[PDB]
Amino acid sequence: SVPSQKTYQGSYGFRLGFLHSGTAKSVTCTYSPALNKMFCQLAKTCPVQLWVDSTPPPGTRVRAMAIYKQSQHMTEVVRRCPHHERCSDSDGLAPPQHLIRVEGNLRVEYLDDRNTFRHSVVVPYEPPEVGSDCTTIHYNYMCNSSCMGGMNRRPILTIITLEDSSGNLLGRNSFEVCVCACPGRDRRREEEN
Ligand SMILES: [Zn+2]
Structure with missing residues (x-):
């Protein structure tokens, strides 16, 4: 019933990378390789890199979806808290309830699953930019982990899926x-164990 989160590289050798951003006070987004965990600020640019060994055809799509990490909460749909959804932060594309947005891509598509009610955001796969070995997507998380009513400090996974134009699954990672508020300090803190 719960969406799969099993890693699969697949035919194209798909995996994720992240900027090596460090943990200064001013970083807005920082990834910990030890924890496989992203720390980021509300509404700020969160670059996720897509790495492939061979190029997927045009038509290929990239989906992002959030689920709760813990088993007791896994079947609960991850959505925004009431204070955040019912606030004028819309961009005219994203549904107000969706945690994950994509910025700087007018081909962005949002889905409420007709059967699971789960939220996801999908953008066209595009090859690496000139002078770059990966494809970057800028995600926005629109609720704090601390938000009472939303996640409420409960840990979440983001699952990134690569799909062909017909919806066939090509690869997965998470x-x-x-x-x-302070991604840098918080990453340092959580690695202290
Ligand atoms: Zn919130």
Whole structure:
């Protein structure tokens, strides 16, 4: 019933990478390789890189979806808290309830699953930019992890899926995410164990 989170590289050798951003006070987004966990700020650019060994055809799509990490909460749909959804932060594309947005891509598509009610955001796959070995997507997380009513400090996974134009699954990967005021300090803190 719960969406699969099993890693699969598949035919194209698909995996994720992240900027090596460090943990200074001013970083807005920082990834910990030890924890496989992203720490980022509400509404700020969160670059996720897509790495492939061979190029997928045009038509290929890239989906992102959040699920709760813990088993007791896994079947609960991850959505925004009431204070955040019912606030004028819309971009005219994203449904107000969706945690994950994509910025700087007018081909963005949002889905409420007709059967699971789960939210996801999908953008066209595009090959790497000139002078770059990966494809970057800028995600936005629109709720703090601390938001009472929403996640309420409960840890979440973001699952990134590569799909062909006909919806066939090509590859999958995932990472944990914390949305917080001081990503840098918080990453340092959580690695201390
Ligand atoms: Zn919130």
